[PDB]
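Budget justification note: compute hours in this period were largely spent on complex prediction jobs such as the one shown. Inputs:
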Amino acid sequence: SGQISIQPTFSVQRNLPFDRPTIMAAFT
Amino acid sequence: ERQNATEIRASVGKMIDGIGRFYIQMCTELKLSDYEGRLIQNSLTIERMVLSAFDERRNKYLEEHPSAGKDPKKTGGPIYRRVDGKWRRELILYDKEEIRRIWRQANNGDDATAGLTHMMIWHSNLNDATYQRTRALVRTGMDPRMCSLMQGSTLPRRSGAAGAAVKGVGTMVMELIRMIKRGINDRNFWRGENGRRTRIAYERMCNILKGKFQTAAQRTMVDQVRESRNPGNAEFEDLIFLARSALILRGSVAHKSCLPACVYGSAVASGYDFEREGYSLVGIDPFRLLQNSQVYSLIRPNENPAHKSQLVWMACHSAAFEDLRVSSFIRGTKVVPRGKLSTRGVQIASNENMETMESSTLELRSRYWAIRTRSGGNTNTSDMRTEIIRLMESARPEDVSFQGRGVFELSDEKATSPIVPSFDMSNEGSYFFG
RNA sequence: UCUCUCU
RNA sequence: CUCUCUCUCUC
Ligand SMILES: *[C][C]([O])[C]O[C][C][C][N]C(=O)C1=[C]C(C2=C3[C]=[C]C(=O)[C]C3=OC3=C2[C]=[C]C(=O)[C]3)=C(C([O])=O)[C]=[C]1
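Corresponding output:
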């Protein structure tokens, strides 16, 4: 459990991270 | 094009000035000293007094159904006073009509609901940065891991379109799912005059959720959800699917810096005419206001004032669900995740021992400042679920969004020279609630 | 006029 | 990306 993904607040370049395997495992 | 911008700035500054001068009047009427007037807890109490005075429907309900041992025409809250260096809490009661009169006199005889919505958003941001909503998530059948979409879950209904822009995809999905569950339990939902009203509400909420989404497939799917006359289990499952898809193909959630009324009141008492200078909730104005403002808070024994200050900073800038790396880059100090913060919420309970409580200054200062965005990043037949799944499968957690945008120094008022962060060293954590 | 991070 | 959007029900 926890926070899987980021919701951007500031307009900065940055990589937007997310836990791809956890999100995708619910779609396979 | 410039004239409209300057009028918008003037209107926002008018709202800020009204809030600040109301805070000054309340501090005068409460006989608070400067230190006590700068306490964040006293400002929280005063703001809650304002919100409860103008909560028309709740006030009417309280009049019809009185509460236990409470006068339905009086608001109140904990006001903290320092006597001989010892803090003590007091419960003082104010007439709701008196509070409304004072607020209207603060806004020049106008019941400016914009300032009330501003305070509402400030409280919502504080609650988002402090408390998690996993129990409500699990009750409605959504995964507890989509907390990043639950921005603005504590915003009440009276906020309207101003607060609707702030609440995220998760909260809108949760409210729609609650409506669908109520319809599933009782068929008399969506019937009668109340049925027509709730159908209109459902359509409006679906439309603003559709506006939140960016890709065409998500908009088409929420459109299909909206078109159902009697939404049942299928639409609730489709809403859950859209909420999960919002984790990768993010939505357009509006972020604003809504500061506590203590900062605004101190600024207005200092002599800052927000009407003439102008205010923006997405620019340098909140950062500039926070840099030269002093705020005090109550620290329970065995707590870290740095962690409480970081929490208040995150709440002020609505950076609760922000990447920890960019938040730390903007702040200059490490933004520690929620698990490792040795601090509880800002508000003090009525049962606390008000003899060991101490006071600390809040470090609400940041090295850099950045523009707050509504965008959620770049996203790049009749069953659009497969198309959505394909779109999310193409995405990787390494794509760069907001290209060419950086963080500006505090002296760079016009946002001319951006600074791009390079997060390519040893990896820190990225999720606040992780 | 209430309380709470984390089924 | 600012701003007016106003609230099915006190919840
Ligand atoms: C529905 C949703 O929103 C959720 O809900 C819950 C949370 C929030 N809250 C609300 O909304 C409310 C609350 C209340 C209350 C109160 C108020 C005020 C004062 O001061 C006090 C109090 O207390 C209490 C409550 C509730 C519950 C309990 O337990 C307690 C209300 C009334 O009261 O009315 C309303 C709303």
